[PDB]
Amino acid sequence: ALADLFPGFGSEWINTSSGRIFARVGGDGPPLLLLHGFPQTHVMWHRVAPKLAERFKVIVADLPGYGWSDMPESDEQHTPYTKRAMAKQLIEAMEQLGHVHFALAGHDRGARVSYRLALDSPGRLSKLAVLDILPTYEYWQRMNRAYALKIYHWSFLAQPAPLPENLLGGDPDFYVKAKLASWTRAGDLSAFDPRAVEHYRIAFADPMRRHVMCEDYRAGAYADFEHDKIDVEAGNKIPVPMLALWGATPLDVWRKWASDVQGAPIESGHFLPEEAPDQTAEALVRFFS
Amino acid sequence: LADLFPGFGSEWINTSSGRIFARVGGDGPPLLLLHGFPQTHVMWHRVAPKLAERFKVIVADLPGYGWSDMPESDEQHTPYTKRAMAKQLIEAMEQLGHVHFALAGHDRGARVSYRLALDSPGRLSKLAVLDILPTYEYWQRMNRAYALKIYHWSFLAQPAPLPENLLGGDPDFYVKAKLASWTRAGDLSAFDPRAVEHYRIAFADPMRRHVMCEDYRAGAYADFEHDKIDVEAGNKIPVPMLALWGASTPLDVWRKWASDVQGAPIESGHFLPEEAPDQTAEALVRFFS
């Protein structure tokens, strides 16, 4: 049976116009929403959430279509899995709890939801943290031979359905575990709690969840990119106080996108809250308090 | 599996790297035809007869493709580099007593062919390349748009066993979708069903798929480096050359790479000899005559 990795946290299934959002909820104090990325679920925050819960009301949510959140039906523009749409849905969910102004930290896809939210609806956020990302526009602008080989999955998972879905079907466990291992410092699964890996594996084993992940990357290649392109070619900057953390220039990039940003490296591969939970929790606690 | 070359013999040709399979027909000046991915020598079955009216036509499976032997690869993918493939096919042609011949290639085979022309121009009387630009150029062009359009250049080049593992779940689906996707029609209707079965049978073998991935790995690394040396040195192919391409700039590009080249678009997707056999055969006959 899948483990409870958030001792003493409650659970909520929050209704929205686009479907329910699952979350674990703990602590007390100013509200802080935590958003995971790919190929993970809310449980990736399990090593830093208890520390944060000592000072904040912590809401640990599954992204639209991920984990135990509902999977809204997609369309030809991948609309519900665009970061603009995901941000709107999570804004609705937070209003159900009575939170109209809150702190936000995101990792990977969740971080993309977070900066898009800040660009579209800055009034919703007191402060923003993004973990191991640059804006989607910047990833695509950097596209050349070396990058194309290094993060091939941005273009692979974005191929029209059912191409990646059919490739992922034969042996999903192998793909999701190889990706998890690939982006860590050690290149294996040693950084992860095995109980957390099982959450990720069970999610990836559902073809409907895998289809959502592909719709997310299709949005990442198309509408998300176009939304970002508008902002950069207008010189729009996030006005929300912001923190950028990254694993082993990023601050120079984010300074183009944000007018009040600070940043620091964290000695980690990609999965900062699992690979470097102590440094990551300290950074987030310091910034948000 | 059907015989699609009436009158042509079937030969296994020995080389220091393993046997090359070919269908051989006609009489007159020697002409070698080289297929690409994900196909075999049979892709020439519509145009080979018209060519055999005027030439001795040798329709070869690339090293590691079709019925040709599969030499053991290595960490630099050496035997599936276009330089090595060209050396192996020069050995095969010497077994037939052909040390100066005409050459037409398509896709991967066209990449073997222009590399052969750069390394060993004395081997060729005339050169035709079908629906390609040099490997260097395609990588120089690899921005967001190209990363999405030719994603398989980066996907198939990922370190083993990532693409081998994915391709094993439903190879028939993948190969048939590639064939369809790259035609003007967007379905399999331009192909002879017997030809498609040859392609499917080949692609069903894990060892053959592994060769294909080694070919794309060479394409991302050593083939690119070999081409880069020539571009920087200003080396041009001196062999009289024809560039044909599917209409669904190329002559402008090839003129940077060759000092004597003609070219034309064909009303066709990628698979010229099957989608537009009459126009392709006429262009080739007129050129090589």
Swiss-Prot record, chain A:
Transmembrane segments: none annotated. Pfam families: Abhydrolase_1 (PF00561). GO terms for molecular function: haloacetate dehalogenase activity. The record marks 132 as: Important for enzyme activity. It comes from the Bacteria. Keywords: Hydrolase. It catalyses: a haloacetate + H2O = a halide anion + glycolate + H(+); fluoroacetate + H2O = fluoride + glycolate + H(+); chloroacetate + H2O = glycolate + chloride + H(+). Catalyzes the hydrolytic defluorination of fluoroacetate to produce glycolate. Has lower activity towards chloroacetate and bromoacetate. Homodimer. This is Fluoroacetate dehalogenase.
